[PDB]
Ligand binder design. Structure first.
Ligand SMILES: *[C@@H]1O[C@H](CO)[C@@H](O[C@@H]2O[C@H](CO)[C@@H](O[C@@H]3O[C@H](CO)[C@@H](O)[C@H](O[C@H]4O[C@H](CO)[C@@H](O)[C@H](O)[C@@H]4O)[C@@H]3O)[C@H](O)[C@H]2NC(C)=O)[C@H](O)[C@H]1NC(C)=O
Ligand SMILES: *[C@@H]1O[C@H](CO)[C@@H](O[C@@H]2O[C@H](CO)[C@@H](O[C@@H]3O[C@H](CO)[C@@H](O)[C@H](O[C@H]4O[C@H](CO)[C@@H](O)[C@H](O)[C@@H]4O)[C@@H]3O)[C@H](O)[C@H]2NC(C)=O)[C@H](O)[C@H]1NC(C)=O
Ligand SMILES: *[C@@H]1O[C@H](CO)[C@@H](O[C@@H]2O[C@H](CO)[C@@H](O)[C@H](O)[C@H]2NC(C)=O)[C@H](O)[C@H]1NC(C)=O
Ligand SMILES: *[C@@H]1O[C@H](CO)[C@@H](O[C@@H]2O[C@H](CO)[C@@H](O)[C@H](O)[C@H]2NC(C)=O)[C@H](O)[C@H]1NC(C)=O
Ligand SMILES: *[C@@H]1O[C@H](CO)[C@@H](O)[C@H](O)[C@H]1NC(C)=O
Ligand SMILES: *[C@@H]1O[C@H](CO)[C@@H](O)[C@H](O)[C@H]1NC(C)=O
Ligand SMILES: *[C@@H]1O[C@H](CO)[C@@H](O)[C@H](O)[C@H]1NC(C)=O
Ligand SMILES: *[C@@H]1O[C@H](CO)[C@@H](O)[C@H](O)[C@H]1NC(C)=O
Ligand SMILES: *[C@@H]1O[C@H](CO)[C@@H](O)[C@H](O)[C@H]1NC(C)=O
Ligand SMILES: *[C@@H]1O[C@H](CO)[C@@H](O)[C@H](O)[C@H]1NC(C)=O
Ligand SMILES: *[C@@H]1O[C@H](CO)[C@@H](O)[C@H](O)[C@H]1NC(C)=O
Ligand SMILES: *[C@@H]1O[C@H](CO)[C@@H](O)[C@H](O)[C@H]1NC(C)=O
Ligand SMILES: *[C@@H]1O[C@H](CO)[C@@H](O)[C@H](O)[C@H]1NC(C)=O
Ligand SMILES: *[C@@H]1O[C@H](CO)[C@@H](O)[C@H](O)[C@H]1NC(C)=O
Ligand SMILES: *[C@@H]1O[C@H](CO)[C@@H](O)[C@H](O)[C@H]1NC(C)=O
Ligand SMILES: *[C@@H]1O[C@H](CO)[C@@H](O)[C@H](O)[C@H]1NC(C)=O
Ligand SMILES: *[C@@H]1O[C@H](CO)[C@@H](O)[C@H](O)[C@H]1NC(C)=O
Ligand SMILES: *[C@@H]1O[C@H](CO)[C@@H](O)[C@H](O)[C@H]1NC(C)=O
Ligand SMILES: *[C@@H]1O[C@H](CO)[C@@H](O)[C@H](O)[C@H]1NC(C)=O
Ligand SMILES: *[C@@H]1O[C@H](CO)[C@@H](O)[C@H](O)[C@H]1NC(C)=O
Ligand SMILES: *[C@@H]1O[C@H](CO)[C@@H](O)[C@H](O)[C@H]1NC(C)=O
Ligand SMILES: *[C@@H]1O[C@H](CO)[C@@H](O)[C@H](O)[C@H]1NC(C)=O
Ligand SMILES: *[C@@H]1O[C@H](CO)[C@@H](O)[C@H](O)[C@H]1NC(C)=O
Ligand SMILES: *[C@@H]1O[C@H](CO)[C@@H](O)[C@H](O)[C@H]1NC(C)=O
Ligand SMILES: *[C@@H]1O[C@H](CO)[C@@H](O)[C@H](O)[C@H]1NC(C)=O
Ligand SMILES: *[C@@H]1O[C@H](CO)[C@@H](O)[C@H](O)[C@H]1NC(C)=O
Ligand SMILES: *[C@@H]1O[C@H](CO)[C@@H](O)[C@H](O)[C@H]1NC(C)=O
Ligand SMILES: *[C@@H]1O[C@H](CO)[C@@H](O)[C@H](O)[C@H]1NC(C)=O
Ligand SMILES: *[C@@H]1O[C@H](CO)[C@@H](O)[C@H](O)[C@H]1NC(C)=O
Ligand SMILES: *[C@@H]1O[C@H](CO)[C@@H](O)[C@H](O)[C@H]1NC(C)=O
Ligand SMILES: *[C@@H]1O[C@H](CO)[C@@H](O)[C@H](O)[C@H]1NC(C)=O
Ligand SMILES: *[C@@H]1O[C@H](CO)[C@@H](O)[C@H](O)[C@H]1NC(C)=O
Ligand SMILES: *[C@@H]1O[C@H](CO)[C@@H](O)[C@H](O)[C@H]1NC(C)=O
Ligand SMILES: *[C@@H]1O[C@H](CO)[C@@H](O)[C@H](O)[C@H]1NC(C)=O
Ligand SMILES: *[C@@H]1O[C@H](CO)[C@@H](O)[C@H](O)[C@H]1NC(C)=O
Ligand SMILES: *[C@@H]1O[C@H](CO)[C@@H](O)[C@H](O)[C@H]1NC(C)=O
Lengths: 443, 125, 103, 125, 443, 125
C-alpha cells in the first residue's frame, strides 16, 4: 500500500552547538578578521512554528564570552610591556588645588625609569591614582609600588586601539540556522509561538559593565524580569527596560599624556599633570526618570513576589570593586561609580542623582591570573552619554521578614550581560534528509 | 538564496515538499581564521555524508526519491491525509526519530543492493 | 602651458563658461583635466576631475567637457558665492586663472 | 591531467564541447599551511556548488544534459550555426551573462520540480 | 525549436583574485613550507584567444609583496635579539692603513657587553660603519649610539640563513588558472593575442634592489618601456633590457667574524678587525656596454616623447639612502652604490665605470616601524657578479624646456621590481558551467 | 559504521562485491588543530576525485556500474571463475595495477563521451 519515499531538503532541525562566525560593518574586537556584513540581511518569519528557547543554556553566550576574552588577549599581545615599571616609587600628595572629594585619591610618584640605552637611567615623575598604588611597608617611608607587581605582569594598552564597543553579529555556518524569538513578552525560557530565522543576530555591542546594562536592547512594551529560577537567590535577575535611562558620566579633569622612552622603541604613557583644577569623576542620572523606572521594575517584581510584598533596593553587600560599584569603560577611561544612591529605596504597595566615580589606570579585566593591563591616560576631558537599558540584581536570601524583598546590584560575570542580548537567539542544525510513506513505488 | 529558507517549517508536509530546493541550496557555503575554516570543512562533510546516503540508496541526484521498501505500520499507522495534509515535517521527524535507522538499514541493504545486483544480471542476458 | 581667460563675468540666474586652451598637441593627454576653485584667502577645492566627473558633495551646477585641445567648465546657476579663482590642471601644469565676477 | 587544459578556449563551441572532461578534471585538487588549506577548501565548495546546481536540475552525473526549458529568442536570436560553428564559449558567456540567472531559475523551478513531482505521481499508478 | 542544454566543463573564465600557492625546486623564503616543484611543467598554448592583461592591477604583485614581507618576518622571529646592544659606545677612528675613500667610514667602538652570567660584564670592541652610528651628543665626547636605539628594536639575522635569492613559482589552486602573455612586444597593458595557460609562473627570484633590476628576465627582442601612464610623471617607468649588463660588485676588505656571548645561549657577531688594507666596496660596469644599453633605452623613449626630444639621464634628486643609491644584498652584505656615473649623460637626436658603495650592518628593510635587523659580518672577501636586466626610472616633471626630457633613478617600492617579472601573468577563475540552445529535448 | 570494514579483504571478489557499502561508508569522516583539519580536507578531496571519476564515466551514484568497454585479454586472460570465485580483490589489483590507466582512459574517452553525444543526438530526433 505505502512505500518509503526519501525527501532531501526537509525543513527540520535539531538543537545544536557549533562555532558561529562573525559579521561586522585598530579595534579590540579585531574587525578585520571578522567577515564584512551584508546590507539588508534577510529575516524570514516561520509561521505556525512554536520553538522552545532556553536563554540559560544558550551556547551563544559561552561562545561570545570566550571570543571576547580571546580578542582582548590578542589585542594586548603586540602592545608595549611595562614590566620595568615595578620599581620603588616615591609618592607625595598632589600640590595643586584639590577638592575634598579628591584629597588623597591622586598621588605624584617619582621613580628611576630605564631609557633606550641600557647603561643610562632617567628620573621621571607620573601621577597615579590611589586605587593602583600600594604602600611597600607599613612604616611612613613614602615608598610605594604598583598594585600588580607582586602577582602579575602588566602590559600597556596600545593607544591606537579604541575601546569603543562596536556592534558585532553572530552568523551561523551553512547547515545551521539562527532562530529568533519575536514574542515581545517572552520571559526567557519556554515555548515561543512567534519565531523567525535569521542569517545573523542583530548588532550586539560587547559592552563590559557591572550592575547596569549599557547601550543594550530595550523591551518592546513592558519591563521584562528574567531569571533562571526566581525562587533561587543564588541566580541573578536580569531586568530589561522598555525605556532607556540616560546617564551622563564625566571625568572633569583636563589631562595630558606624557611619553617616556623606556626601551629602544617602547613608550610608556604617564598622566603627568592636570591643567586647571582637580575634580572627581562622576555620573548624573535624572531623578524622576530613574524613579519611574524603579516603579516599573517594582510593578514587574510584584508579579513574582506578591502584590502586597514590600520591594526594597539597597547597595551591593560585598565583593570586589568591579562588582560593588558600577564599573565601565568610556572614552578610554575606566570608571568605578558608586551606585548607593540609585538603590536606596523602599516601595510599599499603597533634579539629578550624582554617583561619585573613582578611576583606575591598572585594570585586571575578568579574573585572569598573572596578566594586568595599564590603561594609558586620555588627553582632554571625557564626556560620556550612555543609555541604561537594564539591571543585574540579586535577591537577598535568608530573610527573616516575609513581607519585604530586598534586591541589590550584582555583576562581574559578563555572561549575564551578553545573555541579556542573546536571550532571543537559538542555534539549530538542519536535518534536510527524511523519509515518509507515499503511494509511489520504484520501478 | 537565503530568502524563503525554512519558510515551510510550519507548513504541512505536502506543502513543505515543494520547497526542497530552498533548504537544499542553504546547506553549502589569528585562530578565527582556522575555526571558521573548520566550520566550512564541517559543512562539506555533512553535505557529502547526506549525498553518500542518497548514493548508497538509489536516490543520487534526486530531491524526491521513490523506493521499494514497504512502509511498516509499526513505524506509523497514520493515513496519508494525516501525514501530508494535517501534519508538519517537524512533528513527523519527532515521531519517526525512533525508527529512522531501521528504515535506513532497509533502504541500504535489501532494496538497493539487490536491485543493483539484479541489474548487473539483467544486463548480461 | 594651459592658457585661460584673465576674467569671466555672469549675472545671477544665468550660466558662465570658462575655457582652458593647451599649447601642446592632443596626443590623448587631456583625459585627466581637473578644475579648482580658490575662494580668496583659502586653499583650492576640486570641482571637476577627469573632464566631467564631480567629487561627492559638489553641486551639479559645475560641469565641464572637452573638445580637442580646448576644455571648458560651465558654472550653470551662478550665485554670489562664485567669486573665486578657477584653475584648469593637467597633471602638474595649472591654468593661468580666471576671476569669475558676479554681477 | 593538466595537459590540454583550456585548449579549446579559442575553439568553436561545438569543437570545444568534446573536451569537457579536460576542464572537469582540473577543478578538483606557518600561516602558509593555513592559507593554502583554505584555498583547497574553497575549491571543494565551488565544485560542490556546481554539482549541487546539476543536482537541483536533472543533470546530476552528466557533462552534457538536455532539459525541458524552451530557449527564448530574447536571450539570443542567433542560429545554431552562429553559436556552435562560428562562435566560442567566451563570447557566448559574455553575451549570456546578462540572462544566466533567468535560465537558471527556469531550470531550477518549473522543469525539474514539476518533472520530479510528475514521476512521483506516475510511480503510484 | 531550441531547448536549454547544460554543459559542464566549459572553457570559460573570469577575472579573479585568490591566494596563489608556492612551488620551489635554512632559507629566508622558507622553501620547506613551499610545495616541491614538478619537472617539465605543462605549458598549453591557447590558439585564437585574445586576453586583456593589466600589469598595473595585477594582484600577483600585491600577494608577492605581502608574502616576501611575511617570510622575512618569519625568518627573523627565531633569531637572536640584540636589544642589549643599546649602550653607550666609545668610538675612535681605525688605526690601520686606510684609503682616503674610507677615512672616517669605519669606527672602532668599545662597550660594556653582557655575558651569560647576569652579575658579570665584559669589555669588548667591534668595528662599526659610519652609516650605523649616531653621535649621542653634539659635544666632542666621543660617545656614540647605534642608529636604531631611539626608534626601533634590533634583531640579529641568523648566520645560517642565506640571503641568496632562489627562484620561486606562483601556482594557481584548482578551479583557477594562470594565463601567460607570450607576445614579445607587449607594452604591459591591453589585449594580448598570444596567450598560454600555465600551472605556475616561471622561476622568479625575489631580488631586493633599487634603481637597477638585477637577475631578472630579459626582453626577447627589443628594450621594453612600460609605464601605467607615460604622461604621468608620478608613475615609474620600468625598462626591461633585451641584453644584460654585467655588474661586478666587491667588498675588497678581508673580514673576520668575532663571536661574543651576550646571553646563556645567545651570540652576537661583530666585525672585529680587517686583515690587510682597508679599501672601499665598489661596483664595476663596462662603459661601452652601458653606453649602448642607454642608447637603446633612449631610442625606445623617443617613441613616447618624440624623435627630436633630448633625453637626459641624471642622478636621483632625493629620498633616503635606499632610493638615492642602488641598494642591494649580495654575499650576505648590503651595498649602497652611488650610480651618479651611470646616469650622467645628454642624448641629442643627431674602460669601466666604477660606482663607490657604502656598507651598513643595520638594515631596516622596507619601511616597517619598530623593527630593524643587524646583518652579521661575512668572513673573507665578497665578490659578486650580477646581470642588470632593467631600470626603474622617474621622469622629471614641471619642465621649463619642452625639447629635453630628464630621467632619474627611483625605487624603494619593491612592487615595481616584482611587477617587472609578473607583468605577463594573470590569474583567472574557471567557469565550467554554461547553457546553450540545442535541438535536444529531455524525454 | 566501522563494523565489518575490510572484512571481505580476504574473501573472493564475488563474495567481497556484496559488502561495497561497508567500505563506501568508511571513506568519509595548537598545530594539531590544523594538521587534523588538513587530514579531513584530504579525505574529502579523495572522495570527490573518486566520485568525479564515476561521473566522467557513466557510473555516478552507483557502486556496481556496467560499461561498454570490451575486456582485453592482454589485460587479463583469466576466466570468470578464476577471478570471482577463486581470487581476492587485492591479488586482482596487484595484477591489474599495470593496466588500470588504459582501462580508465577507455572508460573516460570512447564510451562515455560517445554515448553522451549519441544521447544528445537521439533526444532531438
Ligand atoms: C554608549 O554609546 C555612546 C554613543 O555611541 C558612547 O559614547 C560615545 O563614545 C565615543 C568613544 O568614547 C565618543 O567618541 C569620542 O568622542 C570624543 C569627543 O571629543 C573624541 O575626541 C574621540 O576621538 C578621539 O579618540 C578616539 C579613540 O577613542 C580616536 O580614534 C580619535 O582620533 C580621537 O583621539 C571619539 O570620537 C562619542 O562621542 C560618544 N558619544 C556621545 C554621544 O557621547 C558611549 O561610550 C557608550 N557607552 C559605553 C559604556 O560604552
Ligand atoms: C645574481 O646571481 C648571481 C649568480 O647566482 C649571484 O651571485 C652568486 O651569489 C652567491 C651568494 O652570494 C655566491 O655563492 C657564494 O659563493 C662564495 C664564494 O666563496 C661562497 O663562499 C658562499 O658560500 C658561503 O656562504 C653561504 C651562505 O651565503 C654558506 O651556505 C656556505 O657554507 C659558505 O659559508 C656561496 O657559495 C655565488 O658564488 C655567486 N655567483 C657568482 C657567479 O658570482 C648574485 O648574488 C645575484 N645577485 C643578487 C643581487 O642577488
Ligand atoms: C610632581 O613632582 C615633581 C617633582 O618630583 C614636580 O616637578 C617639579 O615641579 C616644579 C613646580 O614648580 C618645577 O619647578 C620643577 O622643575 C619640577 N621638577 C622636575 C624634575 O620636573 C611636579 O610638578 C609635581 N607635579 C604635581 C602635579 O604635583
Ligand atoms: C680597536 O680598539 C681596541 C682597544 O679598544 C684594540 O685592541 C687592542 O689592540 C692593541 C693593538 O696593539 C693590542 O695590543 C691590545 O691588547 C688590544 N686590546 C684589547 C682589549 O683587545 C683594537 O686593536 C682596535 N682595532 C682596530 C681595528 O683599530
Ligand atoms: C597625604 O594624603 C594622605 C591620603 O592618602 C593623607 O592621609 C595624608 O595626611 C596627607 N599628608 C600630608 C598632606 O602631608
Ligand atoms: C633614583 O636613583 C638614585 C641613585 O641614582 C637614588 O638616590 C634615588 O633615590 C632614586 N630615586 C627614586 C625615586 O627611587
Ligand atoms: C518562565 O516561565 C516558565 C514556565 O513557562 C518558568 O519556569 C520560569 O521560571 C519563568 N521565568 C520567570 C522569570 O518568571
Ligand atoms: C585642556 O588644556 C589644553 C592645554 O593646551 C587646552 O587647549 C584645552 O582646551 C583644555 N581643555 C579643556 C576641556 O579645558
Ligand atoms: C551633574 O549634576 C550636578 C548638579 O549640581 C552639576 O553641577 C554637574 O555639572 C552635572 N554633571 C554633568 C556631567 O552633567
Ligand atoms: C545628559 O546630557 C544631555 C545632553 O547630552 C542632556 O540633555 C541631559 O539632560 C543630561 N542628563 C542628565 C541626567 O544630566
Ligand atoms: C516615584 O514614583 C512613585 C510611583 O510609585 C511615587 O510614589 C513617588 O512619589 C515618586 N518619587 C519621586 C521622587 O518622583
Ligand atoms: C552601602 O551603604 C552603606 C550605608 O547604607 C555603607 O555603609 C556601605 O559601605 C555601602 N556599600 C557599598 C559597597 O557602597
Ligand atoms: C540613602 O537614603 C537615605 C534616606 O533613606 C539618605 O539619608 C541617604 O543620604 C541616602 N544615601 C545615599 C548614598 O544616597
Ligand atoms: C538611547 O535610546 C534611544 C531610544 O531608543 C536611542 O535613540 C538612542 O540612540 C540611544 N542612545 C545610545 C547612546 O545608544
Ligand atoms: C499556517 O496555518 C494556517 C491555518 O491555520 C494556514 O492558512 C497558513 O497557510 C499556514 N502557514 C504556512 C506558512 O503554511
Ligand atoms: C514491522 O515491524 C515489526 C517490529 O516493529 C516487525 O516484527 C515486522 O515484521 C515488520 N513488518 C514488516 C512487514 O516488515
Ligand atoms: C484516518 O482517517 C480517519 C478519517 O475519519 C481519521 O479519523 C483517523 O484518525 C485517521 N487514522 C489514522 C490512523 O491516522
Ligand atoms: C521511541 O522511543 C522514545 C523513548 O525511547 C519515545 O519518546 C518515542 O516517542 C518512541 N516512538 C514513538 C513512535 O512513540
Ligand atoms: C583557430 O582558428 C583557425 C581558423 O582561423 C582554425 O583552423 C584552428 O583550428 C583554430 N584553433 C583551435 C585551437 O581551435
Ligand atoms: C522571453 O523573455 C521575455 C522578456 O525578455 C518574456 O516577456 C517572454 O515571455 C519570454 N518568452 C518565453 C516564450 O518564455
Ligand atoms: C542565420 O544564418 C544566416 C544565413 O544567411 C546568417 O546570415 C544570419 O546572420 C544568421 N542569423 C542570426 C540571427 O544569427
Ligand atoms: C546585459 O546588460 C549589460 C549592461 O547592463 C550589457 O553590457 C550586456 O551586453 C547586456 N546583454 C546583451 C545580450 O546585450
Ligand atoms: C676621525 O674621523 C673623523 C671622520 O668621522 C674626522 O672628522 C676626524 O677628524 C678624525 N679624527 C682624528 C684623526 O683625530
Ligand atoms: C665600562 O664600565 C666601566 C665601569 O665598570 C667604565 O669605566 C667604562 O667607561 C665603561 N666602558 C665604556 C666603553 O663605556
Ligand atoms: C600601452 O598601450 C596602451 C593602449 O593600448 C596605452 O594606454 C598605454 O599607455 C601603453 N603603454 C606604454 C608604456 O606605451
Ligand atoms: C683573509 O685572511 C685569512 C686569515 O686566515 C686568510 O686565510 C685568507 O686567505 C684571506 N683571504 C683573502 C681573500 O685575502
Ligand atoms: C674595477 O675597475 C678598476 C679600474 O681601475 C680595477 O682596478 C678594479 O680591480 C675593478 N674591480 C673589480 C671588482 O673588478
Ligand atoms: C666581471 O667579471 C667577469 C668575470 O667574472 C669578467 O669577465 C668581466 O669582464 C667583468 N666585468 C667588468 C665590467 O669588470
Ligand atoms: C655611445 O653610443 C652612442 C650611440 O648613440 C655614440 O654616439 C657614443 O659615441 C657612444 N659613446 C661611447 C663612450 O661609447
Ligand atoms: C647628484 O649629483 C650632483 C652633482 O651633479 C651632486 O651634487 C648630488 O649630491 C648627487 N646626488 C646623489 C643623490 O648622489
Ligand atoms: C658627470 O659628467 C661630468 C661631465 O658632464 C663629469 O665631469 C663628472 O665627473 C661626472 N660625474 C660622475 C659622478 O661620474
Ligand atoms: C646573465 O645573462 C646571461 C644571458 O641571458 C645568462 O647566461 C647568465 O646566466 C646570466 N647571469 C646571471 C648571474 O643570472
Ligand atoms: C577464508 O577461506 C576459507 C576457505 O579456506 C573460507 O571458508 C572462508 O569463508 C574464508 N574467509 C572469508 C572471510 O571469506
Ligand atoms: C589489447 O591490447 C593490446 C596491447 O596490449 C592492443 O594492441 C590490442 O589492440 C588490444 N585489443 C583490443 C580488442 O582492444
Ligand atoms: C579456466 O578454467 C580452466 C578449467 O579447467 C582452468 O584450468 C584454467 O586455468 C582457467 N584458465 C585461465 C586462463 O584462468
Ligand atoms: C606490469 O609491469 C610490472 C613491472 O613494471 C610487473 O611487476 C607487473 O606484474 C606487470 N603486469 C603483469 C600483468 O604482469
Amino acid at each position: 500500500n505505502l512505500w518509503v519515499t526519501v525527501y532531501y531538503g526537509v525543513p527540520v532541525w535539531k538543537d545544536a552547538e557549533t562555532t558561529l562566525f562573525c559579521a561586522s560593518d585598530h579595534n579590540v574586537w579585531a574587525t578585520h578578521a571578522c567577515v564584512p556584513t551584508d546590507p539588508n540581511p534577510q529575516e524570514i518569519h516561520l509561521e505556525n512554528v512554536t520553538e522552545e528557547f532556553n536563554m540559560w543554556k544558550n551556547n551563544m553566550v559561552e561562545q561570545m564570552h570566550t571570543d571576547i576574552i580571546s580578542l582582548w588577549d590578542q589585542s594586548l599581545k603586540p602592545c608595549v610591556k611595562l614590566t620595568p615599571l615595578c620599581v620603588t616609587l616615591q609618592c607625595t600628595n598632589v600640590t595643586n588645588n584639590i577638592t575634598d572629594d579628591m584629597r588623597g585619591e591622586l598621588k605624584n610618584c617619582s621613580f628611576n625609569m630605564t631609557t633606550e640605552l641600557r647603561d643610562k637611567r632617567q628620573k621621571v615623575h607620573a601621577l597615579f591614582y590611589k586605587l593602583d598604588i600600594v604602600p611597600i611597608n607599613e612604616n611612613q617611608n613614602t615608598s610605594y609600588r604598583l598594585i600588580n607587581c607582586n602577582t602579575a605582569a602588566i602590559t600597556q594598552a596600545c593607544p591606537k586601539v579604541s575601546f569603543e564597543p562596536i556592534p558585532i553579529h553572530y552568523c551561523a555556518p551553512a547547515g545551521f540556522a539562527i532562530l529568533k524569538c519575536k514574542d515581545k513578552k517572552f520571559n526567557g525560557t519556554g515555548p515561543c509561538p512567534s519565531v523567525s530565522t535569521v542569517q545573523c543576530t542583530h548588532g550586539i555591542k560587547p559592552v563590559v559593565s557591572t550592575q547596569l546594562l549599557l547601550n543594550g536592547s530595550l523591551a518592546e512594551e513592558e519591563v521584562m524580569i528574567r531569571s533562571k529560577d526566581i525562587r533561587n537567590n543564588a541566580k541573578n535577575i536580569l531586568v530589561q527596560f522598555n525605556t532607556p535611562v540616560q546617564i551622563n558620566c564625566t571625568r572633569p579633569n583636563n589631562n595630558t599624556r606624557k611619553s617616556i622612552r623606556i626601551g629602544p622603541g617602547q613608550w610608556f604613557y604617564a598622566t603627568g599633570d592636570i591643567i586647571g583644577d582637580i575634580r572627581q569623576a562622576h555620573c548624573n542620572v535624572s531623578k524622576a526618570t530613574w524613579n519611574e523606572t524603579l516603579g516599573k521594575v517594582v510593578k514587574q517584581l510584584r508579579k513574582h513576589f506578591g502584590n502586597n510584598t514590600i520591594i526594597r533596593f539597597a547597595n551591593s553587600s560585598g565583593g570586589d570593586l568591579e562588582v560593588t560599584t558600577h564599573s565601565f569603560n568610556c572614552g578610554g577611561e575606566f570608571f568605578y561609580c558608586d551606585t548607593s544612591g540609585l538603590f536606596n529605596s523602599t516601595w510599599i504597595s499603597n533634579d539629578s542623582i550624582t554617583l561619585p566615580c573613582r578611576i583606575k589606570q591598572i585594570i585586571n579585566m575578568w579574573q585572569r591570573i598573572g596578566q594586568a593591563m595599564y590603561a594609558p591616560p586620555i588627553q582632554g576631558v571625557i564626556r560620556c552619554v550612555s543609555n541604561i537599558t537594564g539591571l543585574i540584581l540579586t535577591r537577598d536570601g535568608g530573610s527573616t521578614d516575609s513581607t519585604t524583598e530586598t534586591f541589590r546590584p550584582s555583576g562581574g560575570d559578563m555572561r549575564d550581560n551578553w545573555r541579556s542580548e542573546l536571550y532571543k537567539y537559538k542555534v539549530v542544525k538542519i536535518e534536510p534528509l527524511g523519509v515518509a510513506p507515499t503511494r509511489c513505488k520504484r520501478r | 538564496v537565503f530568502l524563503g529558507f525554512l519558510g515551510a517549517a510550519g507548513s504541512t508536509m505536502g506543502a513543505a515538499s515543494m520547497t526542497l530546493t530552498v533548504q537544499a541550496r542553504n546547506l553549502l557555503s589569528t585562530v578565527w581564521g582556522i575555526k571558521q575554516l573548520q566550520a566550512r570543512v564541517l559543512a562539506v562533510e555533512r553535505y557529502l555524508r547526506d549525498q553518500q546516503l542518497l548514493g548508497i540508496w538509489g536516490c543520487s541526484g534526486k530531491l524526491i526519491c521513490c523506493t521499494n521498501v514497504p512502509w511498516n505500520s509499526s513505524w506509523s499507522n497514520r493515513n496519508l491525509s494525516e501525514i501530508w495534509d494535517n501534519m508538519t515535517w517537524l512533528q513527523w521527524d519527532k515521531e519517526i526519530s525512533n525508527y529512522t535507522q531501521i528504515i535506513y538499514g532497509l533502504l541500504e541493504e535489501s532494496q538497493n543492493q539487490q536491485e543493483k545486483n539484479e541489474q548487473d544480471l539483467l544486463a548480461l542476458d | 602651458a594651459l592658457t585661460q581667460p584673465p576674467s569671466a563675468s555672469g549675472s545671477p540666474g544665468q550660466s558662465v563658461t570658462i575655457s582652458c586652451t593647451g599649447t601642446s598637441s592632443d596626443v590623448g593627454g587631456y583625459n585627466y583635466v581637473s578644475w579648482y576653485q580658490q575662494h580668496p584667502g583659502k586653499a583650492p577645492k576640486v570641482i571637476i576631475y577627469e573632464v566631467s566627473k564631480r567629487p561627492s558633495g559638489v553641486p551639479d551646477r559645475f560641469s565641464g567637457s572637452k573638445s580637442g585641445n580646448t576644455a571648458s567648465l560651465t558654472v550653470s546657476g551662478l550665485q554670489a558665492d562664485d567669486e573665486a579663482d578657477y584653475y584648469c590642471s593637467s597633471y602638474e601644469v595649472f591654468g593661468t586663472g580666471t576671476k569669475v565676477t558676479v554681477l
